[PDB]
Paper text:
Voltage-gated potassium channels (Kv) form a family of transmembrane ion channels which are voltage-sensitive and selective for potassium ions. Kv3.1 channels conduct a delayed rectifying outward current and have a high activation threshold (≈ −20 mV) as well as rapid activation and deactivation kinetics. The Kv3.1 channels are, thereby responsible for neuronal repolarization, and high-frequency action potential firing. The Kv3 channels, like other Kv channels, are tetrameric structures of four pore-forming alpha subunits.
The cryo-EM structure of flWT-Kv3.1a was solved at 2.65 Å overall resolution. Human flWT-Kv3.1a adopts a tetrameric swapped organization, with the VSD of each subunit interacting with the PD of the neighboring subunit. In contrast, the T1 cytoplasmic domain shows a novel structural feature by adopting a 35° twisted conformation. The structure of flWT-Kv3.1a shows that only Arginines R1, R2, and R3 are located above the Phe256 residue within the hydrophobic charge transfer center, which in general consists of a rigid cyclic cap and two negatively charged residues interacting with a positively charged residue in S4, and which facilitates the movement of positively charged residues through the membrane. Arginine R4, which is located above the residue Phe233 (equivalent to Phe256 in Kv3.1) in the structure of Kv1.2–Kv2.1, is in the case of Kv3.1 involved in a Π–cation interaction with Phe256. Overall the S4 sensor of Kv3.1, which is characterized by high activation potential, is shifted downward, in comparison to the structure of Kv1.2–Kv2.1. A total of four sites of potassium ions could be modeled coordinating the residues forming the selectivity filter.
Author numbering:
A (entry chain D), B (entry chain C), C (entry chain B), D (entry chain A): 7 to 119, 192 to 217, 240 to 267, 281 to 294, 312 to 371, 377 to 453
């Protein structure tokens, strides 16, 4: 029933010993015993214990011993609070689910998370790749395109004989091999090499890796919706009435196309309902797709907002 | 006019008895009278009352007795504050409407709110269900699909004779009864059986149940807009001039289709305005639909953000 | 240089008189002079002044006298701070622009801001209005529709001779007069009569009135974009080459339609670019419209979020 | 080992000198040595140092000396904390990246960031510019259009002989020069002359200049996606099978159009996939474009929200 005072950074908190012995493995629980005087900073005329720390966030630490639970203040950031919990001996996993997400956001985002003589020929190779398909240079190929191919491969050797014995490379600079030896479908990926110096694409790559669950969620939502609406639209268009000679929806498989074009509010118009039942089903499909897509995408977009703001805050400071 | 001190967790608050008497049914109101000395923790040389609670959130409780009204601090969470209101005797419905929603959101969101031998045949049944509609296996039916149905039903008994006398089951395993006797429109819903173990679909189901009013709102908005613009576009296209043989909008009913395809920014293109008045009306319809849809949808999406974040944080703590 | 202590709700603040005399018309400025001893609550053993108010929010009031400026705390709500500024004598217009909007949000949102025997015939009237346009009951008109018109007009008197001498009535029940004597374009609007009891449409009406500037903004943005892109697409499609017999864009006016259908991501497809220059212009138009629309619409949507949350928090407390 | 008390605005903080000498060039560091008594306000009966500043935000300043790092409180605004760091001698670039953006937002947004006798003829010129393109006034030109042109030019001098010798002027009023001597493609831009007094367009211009990086990001994302998906759709549509006479995608360049019309959810429908491989690729393209666009656009939209709210808070205070 005795009472003990903690003079934290000037601010005097009072409590009972009983409250301190509630979590026995921590630093505070080491003051409740009848010797703590010879183990701490003990003012023996004010009868108190001095600790040189933030007096503001201590009352949220003491609350753990007082009530039963550990929350996070909303007037300090994650790192400040975690530094204080680290000082006091509190396991940072007892944070209640109301406060865990905001408490961890910054750490979850931290997570460790001749160039012009290359870019020119990369762009050259991309363009020549694109124009061999155009039926302007296929009278049936032509030959200046093969010469420009020659030049880009003759340079790809100068910056690739610097790689393996002179030591994105084995999985993207294979066409250099296969040219004399997907043949060019891979050639575009070299654009990634020169743009890995961009602070925005690396933040993108980190976001597409910290959000693999919210991608599975979106894919499963879309698959469920597409199946449901594809099968509804078939039976809805069937009551308009052998065969189906009056409707774009001749089977359920061809309805997956319609459903995915509709749920995204794209709407080409090659497939659309033509009976009133179908029009009702399609009115439903449009809104259902809007909501289905709109639920997990904000979760994926906040991740980018956070990581981008952090990676650009770093790129502005010395 | 006498004054009283409350030493809450070290921090000394002062008031007059008069202020305390303002809410007479609470714990504080029991200190104003001349016997609390022998009913509480009373230091009779500092003349004060010790209470072993968070000293930070008390000044928002005392404010109730001081001014007239009860607000919620924005530096603590909902659960911490509600625990202390519970300690002090305050009815948590006196929270003013400025602070009520932010105070309750976490509690409103809490609300408690052989597998490989089954999934295989579920997928098998789904695909065979999709493929008898395709006019490739209808030279008019075929027979290997009928045997595939046979084997899936011969398995559906091994997981269904386990349920009702061996005791979504009656409303989704009826086709098992129905095949030998909607005939298979219901067959797809078995997909939900194996996917009720997904933490994302259960969060979805909880959000479509905590947001039944914001769905009514959206549907009513859309119906109002669709009717208004459908009747506007008819009269707008009529001044372009026995009949109207120059316009997609031959009646007002056929215009509900146009209006809903337009207000969603889908735009198939089977129906579009062709006179200048019609184009003005359609320009209005597009933006009106954008805003109409965009007002309640963010309310519905915040619910998912909250519930999903909570259910995923729970899946990460021990 | 003398110093004075203000004991607000237990918490002792210290300052110099010099700081107090900085705003001379307020309550604090009345303590600096050498007679306040007999005009307030003055402990003449602590040499201090007691005030029975929130001790936390006072340090943001004192800051005004200390530095020069008035800000709003982010750990209390608008109304609490407003009541304290009202108590201390501070003109609530001195709030710096960093804190003004967050300070006023709740007050800007407050701003004070037989049924089945009516709804039935309203719905009946709406339908019969919709189906005289359909060329199924126009072999030209028909007669059961005229009888249904008769019966709803015979009822509209029983709820309209209840209004003017027995005393949305004048500007919605003109068709009553106008039937026997726009004739029905207005007949639709009676739907609003029965839906004025809806908590969602009233919040809509309040939001469509508290955001009349953010509507002018959107309209002006769209007008500028439509004009610029309509004139750009004409000249862009003209280099594809006595007339223009190869392009949807024969003049600049007809391009306003294209531009508004494109900037909304609707895309019917009746007009699209067909030369490479046009495709570049259209690629620009799509994204420019996306961004133009997406800038003011979130401002308009937050207003609805706020007003709806308030109107539903009110409908949940007694 | 000695301890020192700082009495900031009433609130007494304690620390050791050891902590104070951690940052040796600041104001606090000037108290650690044994002469500061004669350089500050030193009560030699409580042995303490009085400073007349906000006692609340000091504990976040003192934390810098205590732990190692500088954070920003979330209960005060940017400018308040900035003024306090300025008072105490702290370099405001030591703010850790968790708190830097929230600290700077208001300053990043501050950054200093006859009318009817003109507007009439501006609108007149715009209209005239629009209708000589229309093939109703081209029997091929006409002459009342040239007379209206003449009148608006012979007014253009009364506001343009007032500007350069009586001294957006050279780069918008060159058409006046070139009329008698792009001839009018520039003629539309005069609309900006009269609308540069609009509070919304100036805020628009400020966000379009404070967000030039998030535009580069969007453009690069879109270019990457367009190239990748245009290459994929060609090869995907090729396996549907002496030429390509069955598909809209005859070469890779013409697929850039498809990809940009699809990634924006516009979907004209002049180009769409027709084989199942193509349909899979297009299903991917739609969602990929949605996400690609939706990542940086919210960053661009928050800037407008902030700058507009600030410019309207300024336009409402005296
Ligand atoms: K769209
Ligand atoms: K479309
Ligand atoms: K569309
Ligand atoms: K379309």
């Amino acid at each position: 029933s005795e009472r003990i005072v903690i003079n934290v950074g000037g601010t005097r908190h009072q409590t009972y010993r009983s409250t301190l012995r509630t979590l026995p493995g921590t630093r505070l629980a080491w003051l409740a015993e009848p010797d703590a005087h010879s183990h701490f900073d003990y003012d023996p005329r004010a009868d108190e214990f001095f600790f040189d720390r933030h007096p503001g966030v201590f009352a949220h630490i003491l609350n753990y011993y007082r009530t039963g639970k550990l929350h996070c203040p909303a007037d300090v950031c994650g790192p400040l609070y975690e530094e204080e919990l680290a000082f006091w001996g509190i396991d940072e996993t007892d944070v209640e689910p109301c406060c865990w997400m905001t408490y961890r956001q910054h750490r979850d985002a931290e997570e460790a998370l001749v160039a012009f003589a290359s870019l020119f020929f990369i762009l050259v190779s991309i363009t020549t790749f694109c124009l061999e398909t155009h039926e302007r240079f296929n009278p049936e190929t032509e030959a200046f395109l093969t010469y420009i191919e020659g030049v880009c491969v003759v340079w790809f050797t100068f910056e690739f004989l610097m790689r393996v014995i002179f030591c994105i490379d084995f999985v993207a600079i294979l066409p250099f091999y296969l040219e004399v030896g997907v043949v060019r479908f891979v050639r575009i990926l070299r654009i990634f090499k020169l743009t890995r110096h961009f602070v925005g694409l690396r933040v993108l790559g980190h976001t597409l890796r910290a959000s693999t669950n919210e991608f599975l969620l979106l894919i499963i939502f879309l698959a469920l919706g597409v199946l449901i609406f594809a099968t509804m639209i078939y039976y809805a268009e069937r009551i308009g009435a052998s065969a189906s000679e009056h409707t774009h929806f001749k089977n359920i498989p061809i309805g997956f196309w319609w459903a995915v074009v509709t749920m995204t509010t794209l709407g080409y118009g090659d497939m659309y309902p033509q009976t009133w039942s179908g029009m009702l089903v399609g009115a439903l499909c449009a809104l259902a797709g809007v909501l289905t897509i709109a639920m997990p995408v904000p979760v994926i977009v906040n991740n980018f907002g956070m990581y981008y703001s952090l990676a650009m805050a770093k790129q502005k400071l010395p």
